[PDB]
Amino acid sequence: EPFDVALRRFKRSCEKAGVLAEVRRREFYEKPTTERKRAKASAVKRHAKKLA
Amino acid sequence: MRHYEIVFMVHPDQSEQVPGMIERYTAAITGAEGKIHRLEDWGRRQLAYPINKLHKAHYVLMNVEAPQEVIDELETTFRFNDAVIRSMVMRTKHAVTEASPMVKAK
Amino acid sequence: QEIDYKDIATLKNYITESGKIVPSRITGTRAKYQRQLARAIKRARYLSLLPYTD
Amino acid sequence: SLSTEATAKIVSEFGRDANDTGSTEVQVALLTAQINHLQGHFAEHKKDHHSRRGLLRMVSQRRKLLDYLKRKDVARYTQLIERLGLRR
Amino acid sequence: RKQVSDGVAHIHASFNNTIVTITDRQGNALGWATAGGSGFRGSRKSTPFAAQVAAERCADAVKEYGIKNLEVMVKGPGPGRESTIRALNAAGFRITNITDVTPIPHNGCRPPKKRRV
RNA sequence: GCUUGAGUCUCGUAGAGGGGGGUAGAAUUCCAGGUGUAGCGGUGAAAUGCGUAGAGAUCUGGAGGAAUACCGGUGGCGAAGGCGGCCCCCUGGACGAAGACUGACGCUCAGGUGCGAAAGCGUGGGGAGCAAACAGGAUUAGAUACCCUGGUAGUCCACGCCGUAAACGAUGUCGACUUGGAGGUUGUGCCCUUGAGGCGUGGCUUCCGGAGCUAACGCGUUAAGUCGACCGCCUGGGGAGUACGGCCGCAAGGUUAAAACUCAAAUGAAUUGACGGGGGC
Ligand SMILES: NC(=O)OC[C@@H](O)C[C@H](NC(=O)[C@H]1NCCC[C@H]1O)C(=O)N[C@@H](Cc1c[nH]cn1)C(=O)N[C@H](C(=O)O)[C@H](O)c1c[nH]c(Cl)n1
Ligand SMILES: [K+]
Ligand SMILES: [K+]
Ligand SMILES: [K+]
Ligand SMILES: [K+]
Ligand SMILES: [K+]
Ligand SMILES: [K+]
Ligand SMILES: [K+]
Ligand SMILES: [K+]
Ligand SMILES: [K+]
Ligand SMILES: [K+]
Ligand SMILES: [K+]
Ligand SMILES: [K+]
Ligand SMILES: [K+]
Ligand SMILES: [Mg+2]
Ligand SMILES: [Mg+2]
Ligand SMILES: [Mg+2]
Ligand SMILES: [Mg+2]
Ligand SMILES: [Mg+2]
Ligand SMILES: [Mg+2]
Ligand SMILES: [Mg+2]
Ligand SMILES: [Mg+2]
Ligand SMILES: [Mg+2]
Ligand SMILES: [Mg+2]
Ligand SMILES: [Mg+2]
Ligand SMILES: [Mg+2]
Ligand SMILES: [Mg+2]
Ligand SMILES: [Mg+2]
Ligand SMILES: [Mg+2]
Ligand SMILES: [Mg+2]
Ligand SMILES: [Mg+2]
Ligand SMILES: [Mg+2]
Ligand SMILES: [Mg+2]
Ligand SMILES: [Mg+2]
Ligand SMILES: [Mg+2]
Ligand SMILES: [Mg+2]
Ligand SMILES: [Mg+2]
Ligand SMILES: [Mg+2]
């Protein structure tokens, strides 16, 4: 097995796992109201998009 | 009359005291006029993650019908017996007696 | 009918290799069965029939 | 929270017929039995406010039914409150 | 001065610094280097180039051991998780197994407050 | 009298509804030990700070507290506040099918009584992380701040108190009626061979939109449409939800609630421009 194929494999596995996004979201604290605000905003766009 | 499902894992080194444990537990149950709807003793299977620095354990499944008091006693014996490393008592809607997938695969 | 926590083989169809439960939007499962699936997966992870992580 | 047999026997005792589950007397009797049964639970769990709301609903329902029965006729009202041991 | 054919590499890549340590399979560390320790000092240590030079310095630090089979694991989100692993190849170690371990708290402890910059 | 409103019983269903008790894994911190060396940490840039008394990194073991990645959802439950690992015990409500039962037993309420985020208060525990106050390092013209390194109350538990929030849908409760479309979730009836699937019928819920309504924005069968019952509340902006009095509270304070005086405005929605350390080309 070549090294470089193992690298992209590992890179793909890391991207699929989503650990980096989880870490970058858990870096600082988010108050519940703000998190709920983000969730609602992300839903109102996905809808007004899918509709568009 | 409540139906319960009990799964308990025991340290493998005590696994020759598993034919033993089943005996007294079934005793208590029928002692209370309960019915052992199902007993399975698939054992020595590998754990997904280590428990108590161990890597394998002896499993025993028991679907039973019993009143609460016998169930609570069993729980305390599980809690105090050092051979049992894990236990879990669950309620079931009705009696179940058909073979679990752990033995039907065997 | 009921999704059994002991039936490991079908449960491994709903977890990633890292052990995380797969979103229902990927497996196309109904909501009720997704809830029973999550309950059974957690129950199995307690009994060490499934791993929490990899 | 009453078992099926307890409910059935209360219905048989306070109603005219075994199928008479809607009469005022059996309704008050079932409400009283449920309240008495729940008294112990709320003795043990003083901060179960959400269940205490349902208990208060049972109390208010019994009050309303007793007032209706008292207005309807005082004979059955007096007989029932003396048989159930209610102050008023 | 012993020889260890099968060695492990630990890559602690933070948002600010990169630390590469070669240890043995049992975890007893036998060499280490950092982006700051490699000569960079300050924000420069956050650059992936500093990560490559840290990997090279660690590889130099582990020559005396007979290390040829390197099992790599990387922890952290910072920009030193890909350059570093490409420098260990240029150094010459045979990379056998590569894994990613990164602490995910499963909602354990309250993180610090957001910076209002 | 009656059964259509209201309620009772029988059988099931879904649910982070509530209270109590156990338990699991991940992570942070600390402690002990092993390996091992000169940095680590932090920022816009730095500097306080930690480190050869051996840190940071890595491995093993232990202690402890708090919170439950994924599932997870414009999903669900609850009167509202709110409720999220898993298991058990106690317990509330809702909904559906079919039938039986009672016979207006209803709706809404001034006073009244309960519940009521977070912060706060009292007593006693607990204390990992975070963090008002505070200390130091920066920045600046100054920085009492934003940024950095630390850090106490508090955040957690038990029992009391407090009773307030943009406690919001800024939309009181109950009932009736009035075109549609696309979804979600949860029951149930009849049928392709049912599991998949085709026709209906209930509950809850999201988004468009018709008539109508509206100052406009918008609402639009979950109305802000058409009506009825009852309750709460408003009468220009300030002064002021303040003073005084009463009630409540350990206290912080809460609640009820003026007047003198002063101005001719204050205000809502939308329009055209101008700007923005707002976005696009
Ligand atoms: N008069 C006086 O007190 O200082 C002069 C003031 O105008 C400086 C100005 N300051 C800021 O923006 C604050 N914004 C919030 C975070 C902290 C701070 O940064 C500023 O220009 N900063 C620069 C950094 C800097 C240069 N010289 C001194 N400080 C800056 O980077 N500002 C960023 C921005 O303007 O978008 C941003 O605020 C930021 C990133 N990182 C940090 Cl720290 N701040
Ligand atoms: K329940
Ligand atoms: K009649
Ligand atoms: K801090
Ligand atoms: K300035
Ligand atoms: K503290
Ligand atoms: K208060
Ligand atoms: K709101
Ligand atoms: K529906
Ligand atoms: K249907
Ligand atoms: K207009
Ligand atoms: K009212
Ligand atoms: K005036
Ligand atoms: K005080
Ligand atoms: Mg009832
Ligand atoms: Mg940085
Ligand atoms: Mg920080
Ligand atoms: Mg619950
Ligand atoms: Mg519970
Ligand atoms: Mg050490
Ligand atoms: Mg009132
Ligand atoms: Mg509080
Ligand atoms: Mg206190
Ligand atoms: Mg204290
Ligand atoms: Mg600070
Ligand atoms: Mg200061
Ligand atoms: Mg200064
Ligand atoms: Mg104080
Ligand atoms: Mg108010
Ligand atoms: Mg709210
Ligand atoms: Mg209001
Ligand atoms: Mg609801
Ligand atoms: Mg509309
Ligand atoms: Mg209306
Ligand atoms: Mg209007
Ligand atoms: Mg006042
Ligand atoms: Mg106020
Ligand atoms: Mg006053």
Short mmCIF file of N, CA, C and O (backbone and C1' of nucleotides) in Angstrom, two decimals, chain E residues 10 12 14 16-17 19 21 26-30 32 34 36-37 41-43 45 65 75 103-117, chain F residues 25-28 34-46 55-59 65-69 128-132 145-148 155:
data_model
loop_
_atom_site.label_atom_id
_atom_site.label_comp_id
_atom_site.label_asym_id
_atom_site.label_seq_id
_atom_site.Cartn_x
_atom_site.Cartn_y
_atom_site.Cartn_z
N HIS E 10 2.97 11.02 17.57
CA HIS E 10 1.83 11.74 18.12
C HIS E 10 1.93 13.17 17.64
O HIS E 10 2.98 13.82 17.81
N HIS E 12 0.25 16.63 18.06
CA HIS E 12 -0.65 17.53 18.78
C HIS E 12 -0.65 18.84 18.01
O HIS E 12 0.28 19.64 18.12
N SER E 14 -2.48 22.21 17.54
CA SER E 14 -3.42 23.18 18.04
C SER E 14 -3.56 24.33 17.05
O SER E 14 -2.86 24.38 16.03
N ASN E 16 -2.53 27.17 17.47
CA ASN E 16 -1.39 28.06 17.62
C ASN E 16 -0.05 27.37 17.39
O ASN E 16 0.86 28.01 16.86
N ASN E 17 0.08 26.10 17.76
CA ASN E 17 1.37 25.44 17.74
C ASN E 17 1.20 23.99 17.33
O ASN E 17 0.12 23.42 17.44
N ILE E 19 3.13 20.17 17.86
CA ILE E 19 4.08 19.36 18.61
C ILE E 19 4.08 17.96 18.03
O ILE E 19 3.02 17.33 17.94
N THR E 21 5.81 14.25 18.59
CA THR E 21 6.62 13.41 19.46
C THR E 21 6.60 11.97 18.97
O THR E 21 5.53 11.39 18.80
N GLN E 26 4.68 1.23 23.52
CA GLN E 26 4.15 1.23 24.88
C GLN E 26 3.95 2.63 25.43
O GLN E 26 3.55 2.77 26.59
N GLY E 27 4.22 3.67 24.64
CA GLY E 27 3.98 5.03 25.06
C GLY E 27 5.14 5.75 25.71
O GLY E 27 5.01 6.93 26.03
N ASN E 28 6.27 5.08 25.91
CA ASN E 28 7.43 5.75 26.49
C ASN E 28 8.11 6.61 25.44
O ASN E 28 8.71 6.10 24.49
N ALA E 29 8.00 7.93 25.60
CA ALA E 29 8.45 8.87 24.58
C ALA E 29 9.96 8.79 24.42
O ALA E 29 10.68 8.58 25.39
N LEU E 30 10.42 8.95 23.18
CA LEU E 30 11.84 8.88 22.88
C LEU E 30 12.34 10.04 22.02
O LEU E 30 13.54 10.10 21.74
N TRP E 32 11.05 14.40 20.68
CA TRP E 32 9.99 15.36 20.43
C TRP E 32 10.56 16.64 19.83
O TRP E 32 11.74 16.94 20.00
N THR E 34 8.89 20.80 18.37
CA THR E 34 7.75 21.70 18.25
C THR E 34 8.05 22.76 17.20
O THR E 34 9.21 23.03 16.87
N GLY E 36 7.49 25.98 17.62
CA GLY E 36 8.21 27.02 18.33
C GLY E 36 9.64 26.62 18.64
O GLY E 36 10.56 27.43 18.56
N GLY E 37 9.85 25.35 19.01
CA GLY E 37 11.19 24.87 19.30
C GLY E 37 12.07 24.73 18.08
O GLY E 37 13.29 24.60 18.22
N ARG E 41 9.06 31.69 16.35
CA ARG E 41 8.73 32.25 17.66
C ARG E 41 7.65 33.30 17.47
O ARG E 41 7.90 34.36 16.91
N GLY E 42 6.44 32.98 17.94
CA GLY E 42 5.30 33.86 17.77
C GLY E 42 4.27 33.26 16.84
O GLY E 42 4.19 32.04 16.70
N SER E 43 3.48 34.11 16.18
CA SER E 43 2.46 33.62 15.27
C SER E 43 3.05 32.77 14.15
O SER E 43 2.33 31.95 13.56
N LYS E 45 4.79 30.29 14.41
CA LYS E 45 4.72 28.88 14.77
C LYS E 45 3.39 28.25 14.38
O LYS E 45 3.26 27.03 14.48
N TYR E 65 17.73 5.92 17.36
CA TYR E 65 16.90 4.73 17.46
C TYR E 65 16.68 4.12 16.08
O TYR E 65 16.64 4.82 15.07
N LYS E 75 -3.94 14.58 16.75
CA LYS E 75 -4.96 15.12 17.63
C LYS E 75 -4.94 16.63 17.53
O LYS E 75 -3.90 17.26 17.71
N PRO E 103 -10.18 14.58 21.05
CA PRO E 103 -11.14 14.51 22.15
C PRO E 103 -12.45 15.19 21.79
O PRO E 103 -12.48 16.38 21.47
N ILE E 104 -13.53 14.43 21.82
CA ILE E 104 -14.88 14.94 21.64
C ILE E 104 -15.61 14.76 22.97
O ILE E 104 -15.83 13.62 23.41
N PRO E 105 -16.00 15.84 23.64
CA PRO E 105 -16.41 15.74 25.05
C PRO E 105 -17.78 15.14 25.30
O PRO E 105 -18.14 14.99 26.47
N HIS E 106 -18.58 14.83 24.28
CA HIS E 106 -19.93 14.29 24.48
C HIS E 106 -20.74 15.17 25.44
O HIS E 106 -21.51 14.69 26.27
N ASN E 107 -20.55 16.48 25.31
CA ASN E 107 -21.18 17.50 26.15
C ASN E 107 -20.81 17.31 27.63
O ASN E 107 -21.66 17.06 28.48
N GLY E 108 -19.52 17.42 27.91
CA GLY E 108 -19.05 17.29 29.27
C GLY E 108 -18.94 18.56 30.10
O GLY E 108 -19.62 18.69 31.12
N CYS E 109 -18.12 19.51 29.66
CA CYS E 109 -17.80 20.68 30.46
C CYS E 109 -18.07 21.95 29.67
O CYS E 109 -17.98 21.98 28.44
N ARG E 110 -18.38 23.01 30.40
CA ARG E 110 -18.70 24.28 29.79
C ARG E 110 -17.45 24.90 29.18
O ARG E 110 -16.46 25.12 29.89
N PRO E 111 -17.44 25.20 27.89
CA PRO E 111 -16.28 25.85 27.28
C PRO E 111 -16.23 27.32 27.64
O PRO E 111 -17.22 27.89 28.14
N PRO E 112 -15.10 27.98 27.41
CA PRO E 112 -14.98 29.40 27.76
C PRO E 112 -15.91 30.27 26.93
O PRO E 112 -16.42 29.88 25.89
N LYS E 113 -16.12 31.49 27.43
CA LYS E 113 -17.01 32.44 26.79
C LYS E 113 -16.48 32.86 25.43
O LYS E 113 -15.28 32.80 25.15
N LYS E 114 -17.40 33.28 24.56
CA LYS E 114 -17.05 33.76 23.24
C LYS E 114 -16.26 35.05 23.32
O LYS E 114 -16.55 35.93 24.13
N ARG E 115 -15.25 35.17 22.46
CA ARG E 115 -14.48 36.40 22.37
C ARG E 115 -15.27 37.42 21.56
O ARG E 115 -15.72 37.13 20.45
N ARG E 116 -15.43 38.62 22.11
CA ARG E 116 -16.13 39.70 21.42
C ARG E 116 -15.09 40.59 20.75
O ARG E 116 -14.76 41.68 21.22
N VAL E 117 -14.56 40.10 19.64
CA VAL E 117 -13.58 40.84 18.88
C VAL E 117 -14.25 41.50 17.68
O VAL E 117 -13.73 42.44 17.09
P G F 25 -18.13 2.54 31.73
"O5'" G F 25 -17.86 3.50 30.49
"C5'" G F 25 -17.97 3.03 29.16
"C4'" G F 25 -18.22 4.16 28.20
"C3'" G F 25 -17.20 5.29 28.23
"O3'" G F 25 -16.04 5.00 27.47
"C1'" G F 25 -19.38 6.20 28.27
P A F 26 -14.67 5.75 27.79
"O5'" A F 26 -14.87 7.21 27.20
"C5'" A F 26 -15.04 7.42 25.81
"C4'" A F 26 -15.40 8.84 25.50
"C3'" A F 26 -14.48 9.90 26.07
"O3'" A F 26 -13.30 10.07 25.32
"C1'" A F 26 -16.72 10.52 26.45
P A F 27 -11.93 10.46 26.05
"O5'" A F 27 -12.14 11.97 26.48
"C5'" A F 27 -12.30 12.99 25.51
"C4'" A F 27 -12.79 14.27 26.12
"C3'" A F 27 -11.93 14.86 27.22
"O3'" A F 27 -10.83 15.58 26.72
"C1'" A F 27 -14.19 14.87 27.90
P U F 28 -9.51 15.77 27.62
"O5'" U F 28 -9.92 16.90 28.67
"C5'" U F 28 -10.30 18.19 28.23
"C4'" U F 28 -10.75 19.04 29.39
"C3'" U F 28 -9.80 19.12 30.56
"O3'" U F 28 -8.73 20.02 30.36
"C1'" U F 28 -12.00 18.75 31.35
P G F 34 8.79 7.46 38.54
"O5'" G F 34 8.55 6.84 37.09
"C5'" G F 34 8.55 5.43 36.90
"C4'" G F 34 8.31 5.06 35.46
"C3'" G F 34 9.10 5.85 34.42
"O3'" G F 34 10.44 5.41 34.30
"C1'" G F 34 6.85 5.66 33.73
P U F 35 11.60 6.46 33.94
"O5'" U F 35 11.37 6.77 32.39
"C5'" U F 35 11.33 5.71 31.44
"C4'" U F 35 10.96 6.23 30.08
"C3'" U F 35 11.74 7.44 29.60
"O3'" U F 35 13.00 7.09 29.06
"C1'" U F 35 9.43 7.75 29.18
P G F 36 14.31 7.88 29.53
"O5'" G F 36 14.18 9.29 28.80
"C5'" G F 36 13.90 9.36 27.41
"C4'" G F 36 13.42 10.73 27.03
"C3'" G F 36 14.12 11.88 27.74
"O3'" G F 36 15.41 12.20 27.22
"C1'" G F 36 11.79 12.19 27.89
P U F 37 15.68 12.51 25.66
"O5'" U F 37 15.09 13.97 25.47
"C5'" U F 37 15.75 15.08 26.06
"C4'" U F 37 15.05 16.37 25.73
"C3'" U F 37 15.86 17.63 26.04
"O3'" U F 37 15.57 18.63 25.08
"C1'" U F 37 13.84 17.67 27.25
P A F 38 16.67 19.75 24.74
"O5'" A F 38 15.87 21.12 24.83
"C5'" A F 38 14.89 21.44 23.85
"C4'" A F 38 14.00 22.57 24.30
"C3'" A F 38 14.70 23.90 24.58
"O3'" A F 38 13.86 24.97 24.18
"C1'" A F 38 13.51 23.22 26.49
P G F 39 14.00 25.62 22.72
"O5'" G F 39 12.55 25.44 22.09
"C5'" G F 39 11.42 26.07 22.66
"C4'" G F 39 10.66 25.13 23.56
"C3'" G F 39 9.18 25.44 23.73
"O3'" G F 39 8.38 24.93 22.68
"C1'" G F 39 10.14 25.18 25.84
P C F 40 7.21 25.85 22.06
"O5'" C F 40 5.99 25.62 23.06
"C5'" C F 40 5.62 24.32 23.47
"C4'" C F 40 4.83 24.35 24.75
"C3'" C F 40 3.55 25.17 24.71
"O3'" C F 40 2.46 24.45 24.16
"C1'" C F 40 4.78 25.73 26.64
P G F 41 1.41 25.18 23.19
"O5'" G F 41 0.69 26.25 24.11
"C5'" G F 41 -0.05 25.87 25.25
"C4'" G F 41 -0.42 27.08 26.06
"C3'" G F 41 -1.02 28.23 25.26
"O3'" G F 41 -2.41 28.06 25.07
"C1'" G F 41 0.71 29.05 26.64
P G F 42 -3.09 28.45 23.67
"O5'" G F 42 -3.16 30.03 23.71
"C5'" G F 42 -3.78 30.70 24.79
"C4'" G F 42 -3.36 32.14 24.84
"C3'" G F 42 -3.44 32.90 23.53
"O3'" G F 42 -4.75 33.34 23.24
"C1'" G F 42 -1.36 33.32 24.56
P U F 43 -5.27 33.36 21.72
"O5'" U F 43 -4.83 34.79 21.19
"C5'" U F 43 -5.18 35.96 21.91
"C4'" U F 43 -4.49 37.17 21.35
"C3'" U F 43 -4.49 37.29 19.84
"O3'" U F 43 -5.70 37.84 19.35
"C1'" U F 43 -2.31 37.69 20.66
P G F 44 -6.16 37.58 17.84
"O5'" G F 44 -5.43 38.74 17.02
"C5'" G F 44 -5.43 38.74 15.61
"C4'" G F 44 -4.46 39.76 15.07
"C3'" G F 44 -3.04 39.67 15.60
"O3'" G F 44 -2.27 38.70 14.91
"C1'" G F 44 -3.77 41.93 15.62
P A F 45 -1.17 37.83 15.68
"O5'" A F 45 -0.13 38.91 16.21
"C5'" A F 45 0.71 39.61 15.30
"C4'" A F 45 1.58 40.60 16.03
"C3'" A F 45 2.29 40.08 17.26
"O3'" A F 45 3.47 39.36 16.95
"C1'" A F 45 1.28 42.15 17.75
P A F 46 4.11 38.35 18.01
"O5'" A F 46 4.68 39.32 19.14
"C5'" A F 46 4.63 38.95 20.50
"C4'" A F 46 4.49 40.16 21.38
"C3'" A F 46 4.61 39.91 22.87
"O3'" A F 46 5.96 39.87 23.30
"C1'" A F 46 2.70 41.23 22.45
P A F 55 7.66 17.36 34.16
"O5'" A F 55 6.45 18.30 33.73
"C5'" A F 55 5.92 19.26 34.63
"C4'" A F 55 5.70 20.58 33.95
"C3'" A F 55 4.79 20.55 32.73
"O3'" A F 55 3.41 20.56 33.07
"C1'" A F 55 6.74 21.79 32.23
P G F 56 2.40 19.55 32.35
"O5'" G F 56 2.47 19.96 30.81
"C5'" G F 56 1.87 21.16 30.35
"C4'" G F 56 2.28 21.48 28.93
"C3'" G F 56 2.06 20.38 27.90
"O3'" G F 56 0.73 20.30 27.43
"C1'" G F 56 4.25 21.20 27.68
P A F 57 0.02 18.87 27.29
"O5'" A F 57 1.00 18.03 26.36
"C5'" A F 57 1.16 18.33 24.98
"C4'" A F 57 2.01 17.30 24.29
"C3'" A F 57 1.60 15.85 24.52
"O3'" A F 57 0.56 15.45 23.64
"C1'" A F 57 3.93 16.07 24.86
P U F 58 -0.53 14.38 24.11
"O5'" U F 58 0.30 13.05 24.36
"C5'" U F 58 0.83 12.29 23.28
"C4'" U F 58 1.56 11.07 23.79
"C3'" U F 58 0.78 10.21 24.77
"O3'" U F 58 -0.08 9.29 24.12
"C1'" U F 58 2.93 10.65 25.64
P C F 59 -1.37 8.73 24.88
"O5'" C F 59 -0.78 7.67 25.91
"C5'" C F 59 -0.15 6.48 25.44
"C4'" C F 59 0.37 5.65 26.59
"C3'" C F 59 -0.62 5.38 27.71
"O3'" C F 59 -1.52 4.32 27.41
"C1'" C F 59 1.46 6.02 28.62
P G F 65 -18.42 13.82 43.55
"O5'" G F 65 -18.93 15.04 42.68
"C5'" G F 65 -18.84 16.37 43.17
"C4'" G F 65 -18.71 17.36 42.05
"C3'" G F 65 -19.81 17.32 41.00
"O3'" G F 65 -20.95 18.05 41.41
"C1'" G F 65 -17.71 17.37 39.94
P A F 66 -22.42 17.64 40.90
"O5'" A F 66 -22.48 18.24 39.43
"C5'" A F 66 -22.35 19.63 39.20
"C4'" A F 66 -22.02 19.91 37.76
"C3'" A F 66 -22.98 19.33 36.73
"O3'" A F 66 -24.13 20.14 36.54
"C1'" A F 66 -20.76 18.85 36.10
P A F 67 -25.50 19.49 36.04
"O5'" A F 67 -25.24 19.17 34.50
"C5'" A F 67 -24.99 20.21 33.58
"C4'" A F 67 -24.49 19.68 32.26
"C3'" A F 67 -25.35 18.63 31.58
"O3'" A F 67 -26.45 19.20 30.90
"C1'" A F 67 -23.11 17.93 31.54
P U F 68 -27.55 18.26 30.20
"O5'" U F 68 -26.86 17.81 28.84
"C5'" U F 68 -27.34 16.69 28.12
"C4'" U F 68 -26.22 15.96 27.42
"C3'" U F 68 -26.66 14.78 26.57
"O3'" U F 68 -25.81 14.65 25.44
"C1'" U F 68 -25.25 14.02 28.31
P A F 69 -26.39 14.91 23.98
"O5'" A F 69 -25.13 15.38 23.13
"C5'" A F 69 -23.99 14.56 23.03
"C4'" A F 69 -23.02 15.03 21.98
"C3'" A F 69 -23.48 14.92 20.54
"O3'" A F 69 -24.23 16.05 20.12
"C1'" A F 69 -21.32 13.97 20.76
P A F 128 -12.86 20.95 42.54
"O5'" A F 128 -12.59 21.27 41.00
"C5'" A F 128 -11.69 20.47 40.25
"C4'" A F 128 -12.25 20.06 38.91
"C3'" A F 128 -12.43 21.14 37.87
"O3'" A F 128 -11.22 21.53 37.25
"C1'" A F 128 -14.31 19.71 37.86
P G F 129 -10.92 23.07 36.94
"O5'" G F 129 -11.90 23.43 35.74
"C5'" G F 129 -11.76 22.84 34.46
"C4'" G F 129 -12.96 23.13 33.61
"C3'" G F 129 -13.28 24.61 33.43
"O3'" G F 129 -12.55 25.20 32.37
"C1'" G F 129 -15.22 23.46 34.10
P C F 130 -12.08 26.72 32.46
"O5'" C F 130 -13.44 27.55 32.45
"C5'" C F 130 -14.29 27.54 31.32
"C4'" C F 130 -15.61 28.18 31.66
"C3'" C F 130 -15.52 29.61 32.16
"O3'" C F 130 -15.44 30.55 31.11
"C1'" C F 130 -16.95 28.35 33.56
P A F 131 -14.52 31.85 31.26
"O5'" A F 131 -15.28 32.72 32.35
"C5'" A F 131 -16.65 33.07 32.18
"C4'" A F 131 -17.24 33.55 33.47
"C3'" A F 131 -16.46 34.64 34.17
"O3'" A F 131 -16.75 35.91 33.62
"C1'" A F 131 -17.05 32.95 35.73
P A F 132 -16.04 37.23 34.17
"O5'" A F 132 -16.94 37.61 35.42
"C5'" A F 132 -16.93 38.93 35.94
"C4'" A F 132 -18.32 39.39 36.25
"C3'" A F 132 -18.41 40.61 37.14
"O3'" A F 132 -18.24 41.82 36.43
"C1'" A F 132 -19.82 38.95 37.99
P A F 145 -13.74 47.75 34.43
"O5'" A F 145 -13.52 48.02 32.88
"C5'" A F 145 -13.17 46.98 31.99
"C4'" A F 145 -14.01 47.04 30.74
"C3'" A F 145 -13.64 46.06 29.65
"O3'" A F 145 -14.19 44.78 29.89
"C1'" A F 145 -13.98 48.21 28.72
P C F 146 -13.38 43.47 29.46
"O5'" C F 146 -13.56 43.42 27.88
"C5'" C F 146 -14.85 43.37 27.30
"C4'" C F 146 -14.80 43.73 25.84
"C3'" C F 146 -13.78 42.98 25.01
"O3'" C F 146 -14.24 41.70 24.62
"C1'" C F 146 -13.70 45.29 24.50
P C F 147 -13.58 40.38 25.25
"O5'" C F 147 -12.07 40.45 24.76
"C5'" C F 147 -11.73 40.31 23.40
"C4'" C F 147 -10.24 40.24 23.22
"C3'" C F 147 -9.50 39.36 24.21
"O3'" C F 147 -9.56 37.98 23.90
"C1'" C F 147 -8.39 41.42 24.05
P C F 148 -9.51 36.89 25.07
"O5'" C F 148 -8.03 37.02 25.65
"C5'" C F 148 -6.91 36.65 24.87
"C4'" C F 148 -5.65 36.70 25.69
"C3'" C F 148 -5.69 35.94 27.00
"O3'" C F 148 -5.42 34.56 26.83
"C1'" C F 148 -4.82 38.10 27.37
P U F 155 -26.22 29.20 42.88
"O5'" U F 155 -25.87 28.58 41.46
"C5'" U F 155 -26.43 29.12 40.27
"C4'" U F 155 -25.67 28.66 39.05
"C3'" U F 155 -25.55 27.15 38.88
"O3'" U F 155 -26.68 26.59 38.24
"C1'" U F 155 -23.43 28.17 38.59
#
